[PDB]
Amino acid sequence: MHTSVRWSETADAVKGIRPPVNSLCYSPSGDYVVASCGVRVLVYAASTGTLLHSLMGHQDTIYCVDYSSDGKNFASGGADRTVIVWSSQGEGIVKYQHTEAIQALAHNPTSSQLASVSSVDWGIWSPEQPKVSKYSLPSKGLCAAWTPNGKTLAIGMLDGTVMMLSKTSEEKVIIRRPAPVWALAFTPLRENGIDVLAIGSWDQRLSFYNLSGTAVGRERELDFDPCSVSYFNDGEYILLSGSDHKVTLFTKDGNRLIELASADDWIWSARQRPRQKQFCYGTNDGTISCIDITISTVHTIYDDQYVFRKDMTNLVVHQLLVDRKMVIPCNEYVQKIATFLDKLAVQLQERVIVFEFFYDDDRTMRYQDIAQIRRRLECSLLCVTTGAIIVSNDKRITMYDFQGNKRREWSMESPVQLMKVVGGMEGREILLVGLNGGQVMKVFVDNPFPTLLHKGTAPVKSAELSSSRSRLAVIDSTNTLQVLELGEKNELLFSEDNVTAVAFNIDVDDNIAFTTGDNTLHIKTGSLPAYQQAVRGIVVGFKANHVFNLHYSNMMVLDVPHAHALYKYVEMRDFDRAYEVACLGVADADWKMLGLHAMSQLRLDIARKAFTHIQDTKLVELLKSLELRRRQAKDSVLYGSILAFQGKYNDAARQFMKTGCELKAVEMYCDLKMWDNAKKICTDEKVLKDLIRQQARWAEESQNFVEAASLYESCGDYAKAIGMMGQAGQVEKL
């Protein structure tokens, strides 16, 4: 887990002694980071680390500092036997002293009152109640904790007993512990009405008790004595400190996850800044360090599937093309995951589990535990297979079986940086390795000798082998991408600059996705220019009709425009590859454009195949009208004919007179029945007479005989002129 050090402040040593930050609290605003550094009170700004306020007034070291939950005022007390209430600016209104030096401050979370702990009795101090009503105690209290409701105040004791005196009910609940209670925590989350009162007892035990004192869950055994408790992320996780000189994250049931931050000595108190991912801790040397816990996401992707880690204990599995979610609870921290086919590998602190998912007849995805390895191992890279798990550290590659047994090892000249399983037959699988010397190799499980793929100058930090495994993409430490057509000579297909991530198409031979440094995704098919999307995040997968992308925690699917490459394939008359590109799904207009360009470029072969996607006979009828002409210049008419069928005819006639085919254009205008355009193009007077007599014959039955008589007169056939004219009725010219 990543840990960010926002700023650090260390108190200077006094008379050879470094003062300790005995306690610290957060303002409800969260800007004021209040800490009790020996005698001084330090209020810093969490956004800048600037000492906003330096409050004095105490006589000696104070073990308790509290900020009221409303934030308008606070109170300060400690070993000086005085408790003073200060305003927002730290102005002392009333100064009063108690008979016993206090060590724990307890203000009500639901009111402005305060609980004072003395050596024999505990009392309530309120601004409206100057008198402190001290109810007797068996001995001096140690630490006091409030419920979120503010109605129950648990009081500590040396013997580990947490006694209660309920205001309404005379019944008293005391929970026994074998170790002194230094800090007990009431959870802010009330699951089904129950309360999780967490007690960290210095016999290396962690316990959970409700208000009835019954044991909640399983008591855990730590590696350290818990000194401070503070819930993190709305009570989801609890912060602990002890002999490991670290602040460590623990689950709700007490499982250790990971140390969140490291110190040099005992840590007094660590508090999470509310509504922010920042927390502070106080040490004995006066070293406070604001920590931005930047959320690190671990993710494994194989084909359609996708896994990440949620709640730092659960492995969430997501299927994207079917959109099926599933959660695997593990209750323990995982920092390295792997997957391949139906198999998956999870690494806990000292536990390694293998999961499998099945396509059952119930049509539901379920997970079962098949392999379990109880060893503790530190490896940099992890990869699961159907045969064996592979762990890697520095330059050793340990291939443990399902139950902790060595199989094979390699020792490369320089440490490896990537570990992926491209696949292969079970027991004959391929493992892609790229070491810092710029070399990527195919490690085989059966063969103990790596196969030579590529040697490069700069270190290889990420690389990938094609779905056909005949081409290899690889980036360097300088973020320069190279694609190599693998073989006896690694030919460089191309190179690119400033590439964050790359992926190859799982289902199609040559489609590559890049993420450039300007957050601009690129998609390449062959030698064509890269389509761009300008989308945040990196590419983590590439299926046939989808592009996967991941940005922070968001994981989303892109879409692959196959028509976009289809246009460029059409432009360069590269129609053979255009058909296969379009076969992955293009619109109807794209199919029509492909067919029209194909038949314009004399390639009827793909024109036949492209038209069986359109459901429009009004273009497919054209194809049958070509073979008879083709059986028995000649090819120019195929170029000229097509433009008319689109819906415009002047361009067709222009092409006809460009190729010199005037007679065909005359025939086309004769079939179009507008004779003036044929008059424009007519060249021979015999053609003119034939055109005009066809016009006369059309006008004979076109229900307009007066013009038909004149047309037939213009034909020169006087008998037909008389025969048509006789029906007109113009006796005067008759």
């Binding site: 292969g424 037959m425 056909s468 207009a589 794209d590 454009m593 009208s625 008319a644």
Partner: protein
């Protein structure tokens, strides 16, 4: 969304209505009235009762004495709960259309204020004015009761179902646990100033988004002042508070959670007089529509179970206001596109549907806000992030593959597109993206997609105030010159762009180039606008529900604000949809209230009863789509939701064809002369084989291809085959194949089924009495392109295409079958090399070498074995193929073992291979390197070197003694 009154129902005796509740389960509406009046109607929400508003059943109920005031439903068990002023609470159970009383209760001390069902429908909360709260089961078992110190005014169930919200008479909101009932939290309020306590009119949380990553603002806390505040959680500190001047009385969420309705009762103080006014807000407080009804006092408001109708209790009657939600949809290229919301997803799913093939393509779009279509392209404007004001403009084709994208950083309100540009408008700024050259005409050879992708896209941002001409260079500054009047509506034509302002001013811009060529004035602001095909006319839906058609002329373009001429014969109210014809500038369909009023040249037609949202008007045909129930099951659209209608002209032509002469149809066409008439006439004449009557119709349609087709069927001399070709010509191949079977000329039927591309039909015709393998290969290619590997492999095996088979096996990692095709490829060359190269990449060197043997080249097999480092296999392969070059291979192996310092493996290889002298020499090479520091192993090295040269004698059946001299040198 459009809200229009559709029905008024007056309950008996003229008694003022005080409580209205509608049941989602079966449409049981409830009504309460003074002096113990309880009424239950059953209205059919289906299409039978949608257009007509069918009031199926009625039933008066009794058992209450005082005014019935609190009525609620329970949909899962279809139960009713009722109260009165006296304090008598009655639960009603349906049985054979009879509502039986199940339980009667009365606290007899306090007035019951409100009911509250859990979303599961198993618990009921009953509150009183003194603060008494009771929780009961669906059966009626008491869970627990509380007596809060203060007084309660409202109640609601928390969306999760584990908590319950309460409102106070002061106005405080408290969230409690559903089980314990102890006060858990108090919700912050920022809409209220906090000066004095104020009662709250409404309190409701819609649980439709309980499972969701980012919760929507389903909460609602509104006071009697009228301040409406929307929240997404119990304690969200970013409330989407939108204020309205009118004072709220009641609120109600729609069943989908999308829309919240607020009611107000305006008295007679103002000039408008008294009336019930209902406002409708989206999830972000966006004011959607306002409906005003004449009235004095409001009794309540409820939504229909389908969310398409709202029942409002006004005075002593109820009003069934029909609601038409603003469905995002479009239609183009025989493809319907729309959007819908999955309950568990933040994003919105857009569905594309080629209704000619019923193929469905689903896209995921985050924050979609608008969509439109033109020619063969669609445009989606989305808001990828609600926090920052950036709109993403995306241009897709029919299947959904994106083509272009732009990002704008300014808040946008209205949008539209045309065949060459996308126009968007904010309050005072107008963005224009001309992605296409307007001079070029979108044609079949050069569609809009190629012109959008290939050609350079120029983008402009202009203001409304500034006069624009072709001289001004395009700019990108977001000018915020604060004009008092802002843009209200917008529309785009092919050549002109039209803007309306809230003042009433209208601007007409050109596009190529962009010049403000005219101005006009209106009666008031425009809620919506539309333009005819050639920009001759225009339609405007105004604020008051009055819709008008205005005639605009190019020569009338004057920069002075002048009156716009209005086309007479068209004057409609409460129109909620509109289209224009593609070919006819005058014909336009309009959806008004509950029916459709087709128009032609300004005159109306017979109102056709319909409720489907309008999609397309082309060639006298009107294709529209029922989106009310299609959005209930969007994942499985059905073709019966597409309905085709015809205008008066097309119906009259159909009637002419049905009983009449062809000369009557010809004179009909000559009288009217629209293209669809000529096409229909020619088609009918083809169908009854009137060959001589179709060329005239086609040439008035000007279709050269159809002329060639009818010429070809004239050349055909057969009473049957001409009809078969006609049936094939109009997509009716199902009986064309039967017609070909009639004369058993399968040589043409198989050709027809091949050219159609129905390869399943090709197989189904060729199995019954070479092309069969071709059809199988085509089917396998389709399955492979569909990424269905198993069926592709099956059809490839059936057609025996071994290369594609190898591809499938390589993809699915079926190497055991991949290592089998070597048996079935001996008479052809490339396959062996191909799958061997595939196998060596996997590392299956032995089967690859077997294939290379079948390829008659084990030299590259041995090279691959070296590459996979099967030296033991490589030496055997080279020996059995007499590859005498084994010396170089053994030298490479020896050098490799030297580099890996595996002297043991090298000497074992040498002794298994019977090499003696240079093996001993290579041993001594490391022998002296050991000897120069610690030679007690060097003497051993020489000893076993002497042993090797001694074993050379048995292996047989100057250097003879020099080896022994070297051995004895370190004795």
């Amino acid at each position: 969304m459009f809200v229009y009154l559709s029905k008024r129902i007056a309950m008996p005796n003229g008694v003022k209505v005080t409580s209205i509740a509608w049941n989602d389960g079966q449409g049981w509406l409830a009504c309460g009235g003074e002096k113990g009046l309880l009424k239950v109607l059953k209205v059919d929400g289906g299409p039978q009762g949608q257009r007509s508003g069918g009031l199926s059943s009625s039933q008066t109920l009794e058992g209450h004495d005082t005014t019935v005031d609190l009525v609620t439903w329970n949909q899962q068990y279809c139960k009713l709960t009722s109260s009165d002023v006296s304090g008598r609470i009655i639960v009603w159970v349906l049985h054979k259309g009879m509502w039986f009383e199940e339980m009667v209760n009365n606290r007899n001390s306090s007035r019951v204020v409100d009911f509250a069902w859990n979303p599961s429908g198993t618990k009921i909360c009953i509150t009183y004015e003194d603060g008494a709260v009771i929780v009961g089961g669906v059966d009626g078992n008491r869970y627990w009761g509380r007596e809060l110190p203060y007084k309660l005014a409202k109640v609601c169930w928390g969306a999760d179902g584990n908590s319950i919200l309460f409102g106070t008479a002061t106005g405080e909101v408290y969230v409690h646990d559903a089980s314990s009932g102890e006060h858990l939290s108090q919700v912050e309020i920022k809409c209220n100033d906090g000066k004095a306590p104020s009662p709250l009119a409404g309190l409701s949380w819609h649980p439709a988004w309980v499972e969701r990553p980012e919760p929507l603002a389903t909460l609602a806390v509104c006071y009697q002042s009228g301040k409406l505040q929307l929240m997404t959680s119990i304690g969200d500190e970013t409330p989407c508070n939108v204020d309205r001047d009118l004072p709220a009385h009641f609120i109600s969420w729609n069943p989908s959670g999308t829309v919240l309705a607020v009611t107000a009762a305006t008295p007679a103080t103002e000039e408008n007089g008294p009336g019930i006014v209902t406002q409708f807000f989206s999830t972000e407080g966006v004011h959607l529509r306002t409906l005003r009804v004449s009235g004095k006092q409001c009794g309540g408001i409820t939504w229909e179970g389908g969310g398409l109708r709202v029942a409002i209790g006004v005075d002593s009657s109820v009003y069934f206001a029909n609601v038409r939600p603003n469905y995002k949809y479009c239609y183009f290229k025989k493809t319907a596109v729309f959007a819908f919301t999955v309950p568990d997803k933040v994003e919105e799913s857009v569905m594309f549907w080629n209704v000619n093939t019923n193929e469905r393509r689903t896209k995921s779009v985050r924050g979609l806000q608008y969509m439109n279509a033109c020619k063969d392209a669609c445009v989606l404007i989305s808001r990828p992030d609600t926090t920052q004001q950036q709109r993403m403009i995306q241009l897709v084709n029919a299947i959904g593959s994106p083509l272009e994208t732009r990002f704008i950083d300014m808040e946008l309100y209205t949008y539209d597109m045309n065949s060459s540009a996308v126009v968007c408008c904010g309050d005072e700024s107008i963005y224009i993206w001309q992605f296409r050259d307007p001079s070029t005409a979108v044609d079949a050879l050069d569609p809009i997609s190629m012109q959008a992708s290939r050609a350079e896209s120029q983008e402009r941002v202009i203001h409304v105030c500034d006069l624009v001409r072709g001289d001004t260079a395009p700019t990108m500054k977001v000018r915020s010159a604060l004009t008092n009047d802002l843009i209200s509506a917008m529309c785009v034509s092919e050549t002109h762009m039209f803007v309306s302002l809230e003042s009433g001013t209208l601007h007409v811009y050109q596009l190529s180039p962009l010049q403000l060529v005219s101005k006009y004035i209106l009666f008031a602001r425009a809620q919506s606008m539309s333009v005819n095909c050639n920009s001759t006319q225009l339609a405007v839906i105004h604020l008051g529900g009055i819709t008008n058609v205005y005639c605009i002329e190019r020569e009338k373009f004057s920069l002075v604000p002048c009156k716009a001429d209005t086309i007479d014969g068209v004057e409609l109210k409460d129109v909620w949809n509109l289209r224009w014809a593609v070919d006819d500038p005058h014909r336009f369909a309009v959806m008004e209230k509950t029916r459709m009023l087709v128009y032609n040249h300004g005159v109306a037609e017979e109102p056709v009863q319909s409720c489907a949202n309008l999609c397309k008007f082309k060639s006298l045909k009107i294709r529209t789509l029922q989106l009310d129930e299609l959005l209930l099951d969007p994942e499985r659209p059905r073709k019966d939701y597409i309905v085709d209608f015809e205008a008066q002209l097309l119906r009259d032509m159909r009637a002419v064809l049905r009983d009449g002469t062809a000369k009557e149809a010809y004179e009909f066409a000559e009288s009217h002369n629209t293209k669809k008439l000529w096409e229909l006439l020619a088609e009918h004449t083809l169908f009854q084989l009137d060959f001589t009557y179709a060329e005239v119709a086609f040439i008035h349609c000007k279709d050269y291809a159809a002329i060639q087709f009818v010429k070809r069927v004239r050349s055909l001399d057969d009473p049957k085959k001409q009809l078969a070709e006609v049936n094939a010509y109009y997509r009716r191949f199902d009986e064309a194949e039967r017609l070909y079977k009639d004369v058993d000329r399968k040589d043409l039927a198989l050709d027809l089924r091949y050219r159609l591309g129905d390869w399943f039909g090709v197989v189904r015709l060729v199995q019954e009495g070479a092309l069969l393998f071709q059809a199988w290969e085509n089917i396998g290619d389709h399955y492979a392109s569909r990424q269905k590997w198993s069926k592709a492999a099956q059809y490839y095996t059936q057609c025996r295409h071994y290369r594609k088979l190898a591809r499938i096996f390589y993809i699915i990692e079926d190497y055991e079958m991949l290592t089998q095709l070597i048996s079935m490829g001996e008479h052809d060359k490339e396959l062996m090399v191909t799958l061997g190269n595939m196998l060596l990449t996997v590392g299956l060197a032995e089967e690859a070498a077997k294939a290379f043997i079948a390829a008659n080249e084990p030299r590259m097999a041995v090279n691959g074995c070296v590459q996979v480092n099967m030296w033991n296999r490589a030496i055997a392969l080279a020996k059995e193929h007499r590859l005498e070059d084994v010396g170089q291979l053994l030298e490479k192996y020896a050098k490799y073992l030297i580099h890996r310092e595996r002297l043991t493996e090298a000497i074992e290889l040498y002794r298994k291979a019977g090499k003696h002298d240079e093996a001993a020499t290579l041993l001594a090479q490391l022998g002296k390197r050991a000897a120069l520091r610690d030679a007690l192993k060097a003497k051993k090295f020489y000893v076993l070197s002497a042993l090797e040269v001694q074993k050379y004698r048995t292996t047989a059946i100057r250097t003879l003694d020099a080896a022994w001299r070297g051995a004895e040198a370190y004795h």
